[PDB]
């Protein structure tokens, strides 16, 4: 380290003291840097003290005196950045470090003060709700951040080992989420989170800490390297295999977290990640929940479609997909619907043409439901009732029983809640599954009218008034069925009415989007607005409304787990992505998608990756959206205009798109000219060349879905090109004619960067856009 001294002599020729700057800037921590270097050299020279003692220079005595006085002060607060300077300078001290260390940790851990309540019942957490700001953590060094990380990790380990019901501090988990962003503390960070911290939290059987960490990973993690994501998926599956999870709150959390990790697997990470888990396929698959396996198959479909993995082949054998799909065939016999199967790659269709498992008839299901209905109305001994209707391995029809009960008696006796409590969370989703088939068969056979509104009202009361099923769980189990024709139309009609006939979801969605913002790194008052929402719309998870409306009112006092981030609106979102894909897959239900995006469209403000979602959607459903330009327009305008408040002007769409194609159609679709395409590719060549104004405003890539500005430019350019109403051949020919035809605005001596951007753009587009290069080669060969 000694060669830093001649560098300091080169950069700092001075005669006198260098004045102390203003402490109320973060960048003033950059002004003190060479003195912190000198302190770090002195503390190393303390070993063999007189041998090579390092005196402070004459220029740096003033800053050293300021640091000495500020350490000597013991009235120290977080209002300025003096605390950061003290941590940075004395991070290499044994006992001189603890004086700022406790000073900033005690503000976020919150010992002594009070216990503040998390929502539900029986939740109490430590007092502190305000986390460290981002500029403070950015103005520490790496060693201060490593020490803060290791301190917080030991605190959570200790509170895990204390078996306490006092939950973790909100400021603590917000700050820990903000600190796992930094990939330069990597071996102490996410690597330790998944390799060390989470297995020990599972080992001590906490479930209080485990739920916080799964919630933080679902709602506060942005850039995770993919092998950590697949390792965490494996750990979620082993967790769901064990832990006797009658806790609906824990099982719901782990299932929604695995659903959030499957559908956000990027399109090019799938093959190099899943070739490492090939010999052990069971580790990364669910064995009981079918819906996660279906989500994994759909992610495989769009991943091998977007990257075009299967061209140059037509046999699924000899590939890594065959082992995964075979191990999903065992543990989950499930047959995909035709409208859904028609969108797959070829070899997936050839695989799913065979391995078709037959299913039960509609009338046999109706007869079985009526058998258990008469058996409920006849038998009367309570423990035999509870044991028979929850026999494991019996055909699960209990939610259909409840449907028929409150269809006409309009109440439930005391015993049904006891049966539900003895069923548990794991079998209950099988009951929701058969209930979904029963729903679509009975809704198909029901005469539409006032009986239909009676059925939709009792389904709504089953969801909200009685809290038997969570909304996203029910909609996921409806949308992932295998029904054909008008039965599929009835199922998606059920989903549209269930989202749109009552007020019970539109109220929560509107109230959440009007009063919250997605930039959680810029917010310090998150827990206040979180408690405002969870007061105003409480989320009950252990059958609370059913426990109230049972005629001897059974008082349950089961403990809830910590909830800092989670609610129904932010648990509905991946299911809403899957549902929008289902509405695009089926033809005659597009008006339901229009009204869904009109009502619930602003909820996409909180989608962690909207542009990648649009790219995957328009890229995978391009053959379907070829002739429905209005629907594709409505989708991209809803998803983008949901975000027009947070993100700056001109972040995604070009202004000349905003001025022309934001109009309705009068049978004059705006056909763009060559200046438009020259502007688009100019934006990409200017982000990739590096430009100081920059055609896009600059964001914080630690917190986006795109790692660099170039990937952002490329994805929003491809979304804008696919969102046009002009067909693929004209867009591809116009992109080629940017460079092929003679053009001003495209400078000579800069032509190779323009050809580079055309290569990146037209490669990232679907098949009918980049197929035109073959026609141009044929045109010049002849």
Curated annotation (Swiss-Prot):
One Gene Ontology CC term in the entry: core mediator complex
**Presence of the UniProt keyword Transcription in the record:** yes
Keyword tags = Activator, Disease variant, Intellectual disability, Nucleus, Transcription, Transcription regulation
* Record-level GO BP terms: positive regulation of gene expression; positive regulation of T cell extravasation; positive regulation of transcription elongation by RNA polymerase II; positive regulation of transcription initiation by RNA polymerase II; regulation of DNA-templated transcription; regulation of transcription by RNA polymerase II; RNA polymerase II preinitiation complex assembly; transcription initiation at RNA polymerase II promoter
Protein's cellular compartments: Nucleus
Q: Name one GO molecular function term.
A: transcription coactivator activity
Q: How does it assemble?
A: Interacts with ELK1. Component of the Mediator complex, which is composed of MED1, MED4, MED6, MED7, MED8, MED9, MED10, MED11, MED12, MED13, MED13L, MED14, MED15, MED16, MED17, MED18, MED19, MED20, MED21, MED22, MED23, MED24, MED25, MED26, MED27, MED29, MED30, MED31, CCNC, CDK8 and CDC2L6/CDK11. The MED12, MED13, CCNC and CDK8 subunits form a distinct module termed the CDK8 module. Mediator containing the CDK8 module is less active than Mediator lacking this module in supporting transcriptional activation.
**What is the associated disease?**
Intellectual developmental disorder, autosomal recessive 18, with or without epilepsy: A disorder characterized by significantly below average general intellectual functioning associated with impairments in adaptive behavior and manifested during the developmental period.
Which family is this sequence assigned to?
Answer: Belongs to the Mediator complex subunit 23 family.
Q: What does this protein do?
A: Required for transcriptional activation subsequent to the assembly of the pre-initiation complex. Component of the Mediator complex, a coactivator involved in the regulated transcription of nearly all RNA polymerase II-dependent genes. Mediator functions as a bridge to convey information from gene-specific regulatory proteins to the basal RNA polymerase II transcription machinery.
Query: What is the name attached to this protein's record?
Result: Mediator of RNA polymerase II transcription subunit 23
Organism name: Homo sapiens
């Amino acid at each position: 380290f000694l060669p830093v001294m001649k560098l300091f002599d080169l950069l700092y020729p001075e005669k006198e003291y260098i004045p102390v700057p203003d402490i109320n800037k973060p960048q003033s921590t950059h002004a003190f840097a060479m003195t912190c270097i000198w302190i770090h050299l002195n503390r190393k020279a303390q070993n063999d003290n007189s041998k090579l003692q390092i005196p402070i220079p004459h220029s740096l005595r003033l800053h050293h005196e300021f640091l000495q006085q500020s350490l000597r002060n013991k009235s120290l607060q977080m209002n300025d950045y003096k605390i950061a300077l003290l941590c940075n300078a004395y991070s290499t001290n044994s006992e001189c470090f603890t004086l700022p260390m406790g000073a900033l940790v005690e503000t976020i851990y919150g010992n002594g003060i009070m216990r503040i309540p998390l929502p539900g019942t029986n939740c109490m957490a430590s007092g502190s709700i305000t986390p460290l700001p981002m500029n403070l953590l950015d103005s520490l060094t790496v060693h201060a951040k490593m020490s803060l990380i290791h301190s917080i990790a030991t605190r959570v380990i200790k509170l895990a080992h204390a078996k306490s019901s006092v939950a973790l501090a909100p400021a603590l988990v917000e700050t820990y989420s903000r600190l796992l962003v930094y990939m330069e503390i990597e071996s102490l960070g996410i690597k330790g989170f998944i390799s060390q911290l989470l297995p020990t939290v599972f080992k001590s059987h906490a479930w209080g800490i485990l739920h916080t960490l799964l919630e933080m990973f679902s709602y506060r993690m942005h850039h995770i390297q993919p092998h950590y994501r697949v390792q965490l998926l494996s750990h979620l599956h082993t967790l769901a295999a064990v832990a006797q999870t009658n806790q609906n709150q824990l099982h719901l959390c782990v299932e929604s977290t695995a659903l959030r990790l499957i559908t956000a697997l990027g399109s090019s990470e799938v093959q190099p990640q899943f070739t490492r888990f090939l010999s052990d396929p069971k580790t990364v698959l669910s064995a009981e929940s079918e819906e996660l396996n279906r989500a994994l198959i759909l992610t495989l479909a769009r991943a091998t479609h977007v990257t075009d993995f299967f061209t140059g082949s037509d046999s699924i054998q000899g590939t890594w997909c065959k082992d995964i799909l075979q191990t999903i065939m065992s543990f989950t016999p499930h047959n995909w619907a035709s409208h859904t199967l028609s969108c797959f790659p070829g070899p997936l269709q050839a695989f799913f043409k065979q391995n078709n498992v037959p299913q039960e008839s509609r009338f046999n299901l109706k007869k079985n439901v009526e058998e258990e209905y008469r058996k409920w109305k006849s038998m009367s001994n309570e423990n035999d009732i509870i044991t028979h209707f929850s026999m494991q391995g019996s055909p699960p029809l209990f939610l259909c029983l409840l449907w028929k009960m409150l269809l006409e008696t309009d109440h439930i006796n005391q015993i049904g809640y006891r049966v539900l409590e003895r069923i548990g969370a794991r079998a209950l989703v099988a009951h929701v599954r058969t209930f979904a088939d029963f729903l679509v068969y009975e809704f198909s056979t029901s005469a539409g009218g006032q009986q239909l509104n009676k059925c939709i009202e009792i389904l709504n009361d089953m969801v909200w008034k009685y809290n038997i099923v969570t909304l996203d769980r029910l909609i996921l189990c409806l949308a992932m069925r295998s029904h054909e024709g008008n039965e599929a139309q009835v199922c998606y009609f059920i989903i549209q009415l269930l989202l749109l006939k009552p007020n019970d979801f539109r109220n929560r969605v509107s109230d959440f989007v009007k009063e919250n913002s997605p930039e959680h790194w810029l917010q310090n008052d998150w827990h206040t607005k979180h408690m405002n929402y969870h007061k105003k719309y409480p989320e009950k998870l252990y059958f609370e409304g059913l426990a109230e409306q049972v005629d001897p009112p059974v008082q349950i006092q089961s403990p809830y787990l910590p909830i800092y981030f989670g609610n129904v609106c932010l648990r509905f979102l991946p299911v809403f992505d899957i549902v929008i894909h289902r509405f695009l897959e089926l033809l005659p239900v597009s008006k339901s998608l229009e009204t869904l995006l009109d009502h619930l469209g602003g909820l996409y403000k909180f989608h962690d990756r909207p542009v990648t979602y649009l790219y995957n959607t328009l890229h995978y459903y391009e053959m379907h959206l070829r002739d429905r330009a209005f629907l594709k327009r409505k989708l991209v305008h809803a998803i983008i205009g949901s975000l027009k408040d947070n993100r700056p002007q001109g972040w995604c769409l070009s202004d000349t798109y905003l001025k022309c194609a934001m109009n309705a159609r009068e049978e004059n679709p705006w056909v763009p000219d060559d200046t438009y395409y020259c502007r688009l590719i100019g934006r990409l060549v200017d982000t990739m060349a590096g430009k100081s104004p920059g055609p896009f405003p600059n964001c914080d890539w630690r917190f986006n879905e795109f790692p660099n500005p170039a990937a952002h430019a490329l994805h929003v350019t491809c979304v804008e090109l696919m969102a046009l109403a002009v067909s693929g051949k004209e867009v591809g020919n116009a992109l080629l004619n940017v460079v092929l035809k003679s053009q001003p605005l495209v400078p000579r001596e800069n032509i190779t960067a323009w050809m580079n951007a055309i290569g990146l753009i037209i490669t990232a587009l679907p098949e009918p856009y980049w197929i035109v290069l073959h026609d141009r080669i044929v045109s010049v060969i002849s």
